[PDB]
Chain A
Amino acid sequence: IEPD
């Protein structure tokens, strides 16, 4: 999962 990648953060924004």
Chain B
Amino acid sequence: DNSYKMDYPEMGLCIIINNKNFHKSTGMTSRSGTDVDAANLRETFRNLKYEVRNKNDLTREEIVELMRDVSKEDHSKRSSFVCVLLSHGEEGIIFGTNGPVDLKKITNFFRGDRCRSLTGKPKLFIIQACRGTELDCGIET
């Protein structure tokens, strides 16, 4: 009643975009350790019964194309949708291997009115990336 229906035939897709190496133009150092994360995610969502699809070092163009095609799939038999983004970033922006791409442009493909098969279904986006250059020095307890 107060919970999303999670008993469809399939739990849903889990798209993991793992960007480790960035073009020198971007000027971003390799994201060492991200492979460990991607593998950890794969195994974690596999146990949660998700159809995991991993992708590596995608350009901004490829990220958008991938998301576009995924939103166009028929999710009628899927309970939900999960997308994990591992890469460099800024506020409201995620980086492709060759450059940045607005997070909004990616999520719009899944809007309740642009992806009818997922309307009313939980769309989860896990973002591991910077959202600026502020440093939290914290406070002692």
Contact = CB atoms under 8 A, between A and B. Distances in A.
Contacts of A2: 29, 31-33
A2 B128 CA distance: 13
Interface of B: 29, 31-33, 87-89, 128-130
Nearest to B135: A3
A2 to B, nearest CB: 7
Interface size class of A (residues with CB under 8 A): under 10
Nearest to B131: A4
Nearest to B133: A3
Contacts of A4: 31, 87-89, 128-130
A3 B31 CA distance: 9
